Design a protein around this ligand. Structure first.
Ligand code: NI
Length: 341
């Protein structure tokens, strides 16, 4: 049964609710982004209207084979009417195709559903500037002050400089980057650009990337692993055994691996600056964990909410424990008392 924080009151709508069967009263199913915890249940046999971005709709049609007649892509930053209700899709600064959804209820209430997002001050000049929001369904993944991490730009600067130094010292080094979902494509694209290489990958991953509307993508990626010195591998293979095995397969072309695991936050974030990050090394294999986040830090979250001034907050992450729920509610009240709404 579909939980309450996935339902939009006063409409026939649900958000990211495909794993509950036929939801009673739902006339339109919205999908914020193509991550498995959110699309769980979709397939070629789904026969209700799905509303989403263009990019998410390319992924539904090519990767899950959802039939075309049930895919309803909407343009961003544009007022659309869906089953008699005005909606707007906004860029969520999460993975490719990820959106936040503004719903203008027939009674005058305005609801923002963030989906998954990384809050940014540029959102303060979107269509959100123009009216009041009563209810916020909030991505609270990192809603605690211990969750600090650097900007995406500092993280990519670290990765480019690290990879360029290593391969210029040793032209026979291979760079490997882990992946298990869409998102974080700047990590492997930025490194391949500094090295003058395409990114090599499996046919299944190439297929996925081809759905993303990235400009000039045919110039940046390939399935011919032999021509490339940046390879993508499943995240599970980014360990010493997995990487040793991969280096065997490359036929003596390479004699060293430098690998990257883009994680979210890890508790090495409470002590170390990005500048000071060091790898784990065994022999001719080095593995860097880099804190590339596609979710808000605590401070980015707090700034957004204090700017938006919602009347009510509904968390969508960390909702399963009483300790989590109580912690999040305390911070919401602090924020509201400090800013005065
Ligand atoms: Ni996500």
């Amino acid at each position: 049964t579909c939980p309450f924080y996935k339902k939009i009151p006063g409409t026939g709508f649900t958000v990211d609710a495909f794993q509950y069967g036929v939801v009673e009263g739902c006339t339109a199913y919205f999908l914020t982004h193509f991550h498995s915890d959110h699309y769980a249940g979709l397939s070629k046999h789904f026969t209700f209207p799905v509303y989403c971005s263009e990019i998410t709709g390319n992924l539904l049609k090519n990767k899950l084979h959802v039939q075309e007649q049930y895919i309803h892509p909407l343009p961003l930053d544009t007022e659309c009417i869906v089953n008699g209700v005005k909606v707007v899709l906004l860029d969520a600064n999460h993975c490719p195709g990820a959106v936040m959804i503004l719903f203008y209820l027939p009674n005058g209430t305005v609801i923002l559903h963030t989906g998954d997002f990384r809050a940014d001050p540029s959102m303060e000049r979107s269509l959100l500037a123009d009216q009041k929001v009563h209810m916020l369904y909030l991505d609270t993944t990192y809603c605690s002050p211990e969750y600090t991490f650097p900007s995406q730009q500092e993280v990519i600067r670290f990765a480019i400089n690290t990879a360029f130094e290593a391969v210029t010292l040793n032209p026979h080094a291979l760079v490997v980057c882990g992946t298990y979902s869409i998102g974080k494509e700047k990590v492997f694209l930025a490194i391949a650009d500094v090295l003058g290489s395409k990114v090599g990958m499996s046919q299944e991953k190439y297929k996925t990337l081809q759905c993303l509307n990235i400009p000039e993508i045919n110039s940046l990626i390939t399935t011919d692993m032999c021509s490339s010195l940046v390879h993508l591998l499943p995240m599970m293979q980014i360990n010493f055994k997995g990487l040793q095995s991969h280096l065997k397969k490359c036929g003596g072309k390479y004699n060293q691996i430098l690998a990257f695991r883009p994680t979210g936050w890890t508790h090495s974030n409470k002590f170390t600056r990005i500048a000071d990050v060091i790898p784990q090394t065994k022999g001719n294999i080095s593995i860097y964990g880099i804190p590339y986040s596609e979710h808000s830090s605590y401070l980015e979250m707090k700034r957004f909410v204090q700017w938006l001034k919602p009347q009510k907050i509904i968390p969508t992450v960390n909702v399963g424990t009483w300790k989590s729920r109580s912690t999040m509610e305390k911070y919401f009240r602090e924020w509201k008392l400090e800013a005065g709404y």
